[PDB]
Design a protein around this ligand. Sequence first.
Ligand SMILES: CN[C@@H]1[C@@H](O)[C@@H](O[C@@H]2[C@@H](O)[C@H](O[C@H]3O[C@H](CN)CC[C@H]3N)[C@@H](NSCCNC(=O)CCNC(=O)[C@H](O)C(C)(C)COP(=O)(O)OP(=O)(O)OC[C@H]3O[C@@H](n4cnc5c(N)ncnc54)[C@H](O)[C@@H]3OP(=O)(O)O)C[C@H]2N)OC[C@]1(C)O
Ligand SMILES: CN[C@@H]1[C@@H](O)[C@@H](O[C@@H]2[C@@H](O)[C@H](O[C@H]3O[C@H](CN)CC[C@H]3N)[C@@H](NSCCNC(=O)CCNC(=O)[C@H](O)C(C)(C)COP(=O)(O)OP(=O)(O)OC[C@H]3O[C@@H](n4cnc5c(N)ncnc54)[C@H](O)[C@@H]3OP(=O)(O)O)C[C@H]2N)OC[C@]1(C)O
Ligand SMILES: [Cl-]
Ligand SMILES: [Cl-]
Lengths: 259, 260
Amino acid sequence: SRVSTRSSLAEDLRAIGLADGDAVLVHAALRKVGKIVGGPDDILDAMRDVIGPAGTVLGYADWQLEDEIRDDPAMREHIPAFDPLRSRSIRDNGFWPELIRTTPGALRSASPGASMAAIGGEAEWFTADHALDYGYGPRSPLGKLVEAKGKVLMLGAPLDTMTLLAHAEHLADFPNKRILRYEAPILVDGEKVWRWFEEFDTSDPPDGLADDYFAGIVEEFLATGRGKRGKIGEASSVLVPADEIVAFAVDWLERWGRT
Amino acid sequence: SRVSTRSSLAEDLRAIGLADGDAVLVHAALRKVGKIVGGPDDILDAMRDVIGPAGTVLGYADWQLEDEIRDDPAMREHIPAFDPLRSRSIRDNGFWPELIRTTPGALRSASPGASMAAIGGEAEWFTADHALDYGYGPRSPLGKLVEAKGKVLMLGAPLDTMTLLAHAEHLADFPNKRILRYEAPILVDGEKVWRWFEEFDTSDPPDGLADDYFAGIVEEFLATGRGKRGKIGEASSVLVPADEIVAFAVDWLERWGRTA
Ligand SMILES: CN[C@@H]1[C@@H](O)[C@@H](O[C@@H]2[C@@H](O)[C@H](O[C@H]3O[C@H](CN)CC[C@H]3N)[C@@H](NSCCNC(=O)CCNC(=O)[C@H](O)C(C)(C)COP(=O)(O)OP(=O)(O)OC[C@H]3O[C@@H](n4cnc5c(N)ncnc54)[C@H](O)[C@@H]3OP(=O)(O)O)C[C@H]2N)OC[C@]1(C)O
Ligand SMILES: CN[C@@H]1[C@@H](O)[C@@H](O[C@@H]2[C@@H](O)[C@H](O[C@H]3O[C@H](CN)CC[C@H]3N)[C@@H](NSCCNC(=O)CCNC(=O)[C@H](O)C(C)(C)COP(=O)(O)OP(=O)(O)OC[C@H]3O[C@@H](n4cnc5c(N)ncnc54)[C@H](O)[C@@H]3OP(=O)(O)O)C[C@H]2N)OC[C@]1(C)O
Ligand SMILES: [Cl-]
Ligand SMILES: [Cl-]
């Protein structure tokens, strides 16, 4: 139990594989890092030191609308619409996405449940044109992370929380993919509008698979030797390439689909 | 089991005395408000609905640099400078100042430990020209709140967290006022420099007074029939005029200083 600094976190970052120009989606359990001089913003600052101004740091924001509130007819006129500039990140994703979203210069994508926050050189591209329906498919920050050959850093975070594998759930061809259909309010140029949405279910695993089955896929990909386990401060962390673990996961799901 | 809405919060705020054009400094214990459909941002939205675009909402941000870290020379090069655009509010003041600070359009003043976040029609005036030394005196959002005849809302918050009374502590003529001197990093045209600061002590009360004596002062002020109590959602709340309670508190302290 000793203090991390902005310079200290930068060298831990490089030791795990973070490099110049990297785009990296980060899932964090910030308590695992331990003591930090300047708070967790030192983590994001050290990240931008390593990747430089061309790199991008992302976080999975989502938003705070509860399903039972959304579907309560008495609540309709009182629910604030999703606003990429104002809607706060879902608390269950930890402070990290909210840390990014509230950093000046950061941007947030338009697809509510799948919304990502991004800061850095390509933050505008990663958050632009996010599909409202199927916000985990190719027209999403997750698809663009694969396209740009980005990475995913699990910063102390349990491996089941790697949202990128939901992009694999979208791409993979396996039978009986559940489809969700829901109505939610979104801000359309400043005005609240209720819009119907549809997507593949991301809150429940496919039938047969366990809730934390994302964790097993990550563990299998690391056994291939294409990842990197590393210590960020005091937090056991994993850095994996985005395109390689998506392909590994798509094949994993399609193979299971043929059983 | 009651639920607050932006609409019902605006009714509660009008009922306690918030009005069109007000400037209100808010101290909040948001848990006491109870369930809110849109989360605590409904409170800020309802307030802006009541006071209108000419009104201003404020919160007491401070910042997160700890005294033990600040004074440890082994930490000196690693401490980030205070940046009114990036330094997060001290967590001890609750989510409310950070809620305001991170709302687009909000501004945050320059005097680190005394810094305030503000949003609304006069947020720029309230946060401008905040004195680095004696940041609770006349050149501060607290002084400007008195000047603008603003209000203070304790939103479920304990009455001793009324930071406006530190402005009265600054003005009050009583003997042996403790003066604090400390060094802290700030940005001067976008570059970190360490600067020495001076102010009257706000982390400890005057010698002989309890740590929570602010609360007694507010209660004594309400005992005169000025101010107003009411429920904001489920939160027992207090709205007082800024100028009247400062004059009351300065009188209270100066009369106390003449005893013993
Ligand atoms: C419409 N909304 C959704 C919709 O989008 C859709 O949602 C899906 C969702 O349901 C799925 O969930 C399913 O799968 C998940 C994963 N298996 C489990 C639930 C299950 N139903 C979802 N799968 S994706 C999950 C993505 N999650 C993450 O990225 C988070 C990863 N992190 C962790 O898991 C951590 O373990 C965490 C839980 C966050 C707790 O860690 P910890 O508390 O230790 O650390 P934390 O990060 O919280 O920070 C603490 C320290 O931070 C410092 N701090 C905080 N604030 C500070 C401030 N202001 N200043 C300075 N410092 C600060 C501080 O040091 C803190 O420590 P301290 O407090 O001092 O002690 C896919 C989804 N799409 O369907 C459902 C909905 C509802 O419709
Ligand atoms: C350099 N820094 C300082 C320096 O400035 C100087 O500081 C002075 C300081 O030392 C003095 O302290 C002295 O006096 C104080 C007051 N008597 C006591 C200590 C003493 N030494 C100081 N005096 S003034 C203090 C001003 N304080 C306030 O304004 C706070 C008022 N509120 C309260 O007190 C509450 O009781 C509180 C503590 C906040 C707890 O309330 P609560 O539990 O209800 O928490 P919160 O309000 O945050 O609400 C939580 C809910 O909010 C929702 N939420 C949160 N986050 C959300 C997100 N992301 N999304 C959506 N919703 C969110 C949610 O519902 C939460 O609830 P849940 O978690 O879900 O259950 C003067 C100072 N100048 O000297 C010291 C230093 C260090 O040098
Ligand atoms: Cl709205
Ligand atoms: Cl409480």
